[PDB]
Design an enzyme around this catalytic site. Sequence first.
Site, PDB file in Angstrom:
ATOM      1  N   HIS A  42     -32.996 -22.992-126.449  1.00 58.92           N
ATOM      2  CA  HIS A  42     -34.393 -23.410-126.445  1.00 58.92           C
ATOM      3  C   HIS A  42     -34.702 -24.316-127.632  1.00 58.92           C
ATOM      4  CE1 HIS A  42     -35.472 -20.136-129.419  1.00 58.92           C
ATOM      5  NE2 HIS A  42     -36.319 -21.078-129.791  1.00 58.92           N
ATOM      6  N   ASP A  88     -30.158 -17.868-123.547  1.00 53.89           N
ATOM      7  CA  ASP A  88     -30.620 -18.720-124.643  1.00 53.89           C
ATOM      8  C   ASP A  88     -29.501 -18.974-125.646  1.00 53.89           C
ATOM      9  OD1 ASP A  88     -32.226 -20.262-126.211  1.00 53.89           O
ATOM     10  OD2 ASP A  88     -33.445 -18.622-127.010  1.00 53.89           O
ATOM     11  N   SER A 185     -35.315 -19.337-135.379  1.00 54.83           N
ATOM     12  CA  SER A 185     -34.755 -19.399-134.032  1.00 54.83           C
ATOM     13  C   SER A 185     -33.431 -20.160-134.011  1.00 54.83           C
ATOM     14  CB  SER A 185     -35.755 -20.089-133.106  1.00 54.83           C
ATOM     15  OG  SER A 185     -37.081 -19.706-133.447  1.00 54.83           O
ATOM     16  N   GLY A 186     -32.454 -19.633-133.276  1.00 49.67           N
ATOM     17  CA  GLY A 186     -31.155 -20.279-133.190  1.00 49.67           C
ATOM     18  C   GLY A 186     -30.203 -19.810-134.275  1.00 49.67           C
TER      19      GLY A 186
HETATM   20  C1  LIG Z   1     -46.856 -17.761-130.116  1.00 49.38           C
HETATM   21  O1  LIG Z   1     -45.500 -18.257-130.141  1.00 49.38           O
HETATM   22  C2  LIG Z   1     -44.806 -17.802-131.237  1.00 49.38           C
HETATM   23  C3  LIG Z   1     -45.323 -18.006-132.536  1.00 49.38           C
HETATM   24  C4  LIG Z   1     -44.595 -17.597-133.660  1.00 49.38           C
HETATM   25 CL1  LIG Z   1     -45.222 -17.845-135.251  1.00 49.38          CL
HETATM   26  C5  LIG Z   1     -43.354 -16.991-133.499  1.00 49.38           C
HETATM   27  C6  LIG Z   1     -42.809 -16.780-132.224  1.00 49.38           C
HETATM   28  C7  LIG Z   1     -41.362 -16.260-132.158  1.00 49.38           C
HETATM   29  O2  LIG Z   1     -40.552 -16.737-131.362  1.00 49.38           O
HETATM   30  N1  LIG Z   1     -41.119 -15.221-132.981  1.00 49.38           N
HETATM   31  C8  LIG Z   1     -39.914 -14.647-133.141  1.00 49.38           C
HETATM   32  C9  LIG Z   1     -39.815 -13.484-133.922  1.00 49.38           C
HETATM   33  C10 LIG Z   1     -38.579 -12.831-134.026  1.00 49.38           C
HETATM   34  C11 LIG Z   1     -37.468 -13.358-133.353  1.00 49.38           C
HETATM   35 CL2  LIG Z   1     -35.944 -12.536-133.390  1.00 49.38          CL
HETATM   36  C12 LIG Z   1     -37.617 -14.524-132.597  1.00 49.38           C
HETATM   37  N2  LIG Z   1     -38.811 -15.128-132.501  1.00 49.38           N
HETATM   38  C13 LIG Z   1     -43.538 -17.173-131.070  1.00 49.38           C
HETATM   39  N3  LIG Z   1     -43.034 -16.941-129.829  1.00 49.38           N
HETATM   40  C14 LIG Z   1     -43.677 -16.155-128.936  1.00 49.38           C
HETATM   41  O3  LIG Z   1     -44.727 -15.559-129.177  1.00 49.38           O
HETATM   42  C15 LIG Z   1     -43.005 -15.972-127.558  1.00 49.38           C
HETATM   43  S1  LIG Z   1     -43.472 -14.843-126.453  1.00 49.38           S
HETATM   44  C16 LIG Z   1     -42.297 -15.132-125.291  1.00 49.38           C
HETATM   45  C17 LIG Z   1     -41.489 -16.138-125.734  1.00 49.38           C
HETATM   46  C18 LIG Z   1     -40.271 -16.674-124.958  1.00 49.38           C
HETATM   47  C19 LIG Z   1     -40.551 -16.704-123.449  1.00 49.38           C
HETATM   48  N4  LIG Z   1     -41.256 -17.656-122.820  1.00 49.38           N
HETATM   49  C20 LIG Z   1     -41.321 -17.331-121.396  1.00 49.38           C
HETATM   50  C21 LIG Z   1     -40.448 -16.102-121.312  1.00 49.38           C
HETATM   51  N5  LIG Z   1     -40.108 -15.799-122.557  1.00 49.38           N
HETATM   52  C22 LIG Z   1     -39.280 -14.617-122.911  1.00 49.38           C
HETATM   53  C23 LIG Z   1     -41.883 -16.630-127.027  1.00 49.38           C
HETATM   54 CL3  LIG Z   1     -41.034 -17.922-127.817  1.00 49.38          CL
END
Ligand SMILES: COc1cc(Cl)cc(C(=O)Nc2ccc(Cl)cn2)c1NC(=O)c1scc(Cc2nccn2C)c1Cl
Lengths: 233, 51
Positions: A42, A88, A185-186
């Site tokens: 991603h 991913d 990420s990654g």
């Molecule tokens: C509002 O967006 C973000 C904002 C921030 Cl500051 C951080 C993140 C994020 O990816 N956080 C995070 C925390 C721990 C780990 Cl291991 C990985 N990522 C996110 N990501 C997310 O909340 C989400 S919710 C679901 C996803 C991925 C996804 N999209 C459709 C189906 N899926 C699983 C993501 Cl990316």
Amino acid sequence: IVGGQECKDGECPWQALLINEENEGFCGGTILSEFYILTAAHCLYQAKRFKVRVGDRNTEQEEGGEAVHEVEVVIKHNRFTKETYDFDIAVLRLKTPITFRMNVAPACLPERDWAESTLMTQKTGIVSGFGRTHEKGRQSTRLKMLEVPYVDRNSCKLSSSFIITQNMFCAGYDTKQEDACQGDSGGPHVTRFKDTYFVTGIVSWGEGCARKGKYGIYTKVTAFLKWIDRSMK
Amino acid sequence: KLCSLDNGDCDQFCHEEQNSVVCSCARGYTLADNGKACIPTGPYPCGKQTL
Ligand SMILES: COc1cc(Cl)cc(C(=O)Nc2ccc(Cl)cn2)c1NC(=O)c1scc(Cc2nccn2C)c1Cl
Ligand SMILES: [Ca+2]
Ligand SMILES: [Ca+2]
């Protein structure tokens, strides 16, 4: 990385940073070998053209170990879709080989059965990166590491608003404010066994960062060991 | 218990074969004479912090 601590000299030598044309990091990666970087599929959609930096712990200061590498080939898993974030995983082949040195060294790829039986049943793994130090914050200028508990698979699925596929696993804390975050990420999730560090995950996604009742979701590298091996040929 | 008993005494990978433990190592390591320890073949072996 929310919480945790700095990677001190030599402690996270397999960390890679994907940098855009502006020289800003937007994703991490893991050094697998002199020519190959492991990262998240991603991440490839978050920058037009990018390079890979290794041997860096402080983006504001030249430490003497930094090296930037151009990418020759991107190998993204053909089954990755943004709607599920399943599969991913991507591998990058670099145009020039990484010269290992202080703060620049590969993490080991484990064998699948042993890793799942023995590494992923350890109490914790280690995640690292230059990502945000809290959900709403800016990216870190310092490379950080965090010990994250492996989380019960059932508990995780119950906690998650999105499907946890066979290609994902969860790590981190229920309420404790420590977690990976955007920008990490990654990057590497590694597990220590007898003073040797093995790649066990890729920082993939999470609902925000360090949120109560939510965990960090990682690509299950052990499911892709044959795929990784093939890609490095 | 074999591999379930303290990793079969292996440094790294443990496999069970014919009711016996077989140890092996990550790429860049060679299995030691004792058939258990893993020895780096060259500089900057994988998975080692650079200290
Ligand atoms: C509002 O967006 C973000 C904002 C921030 Cl500051 C951080 C993140 C994020 O990816 N956080 C995070 C925390 C721990 C780990 Cl291991 C990985 N990522 C996110 N990501 C997310 O909340 C989400 S919710 C679901 C996803 C991925 C996804 N999209 C459709 C189906 N899926 C699983 C993501 Cl990316
Ligand atoms: Ca620096
Ligand atoms: Ca949490």
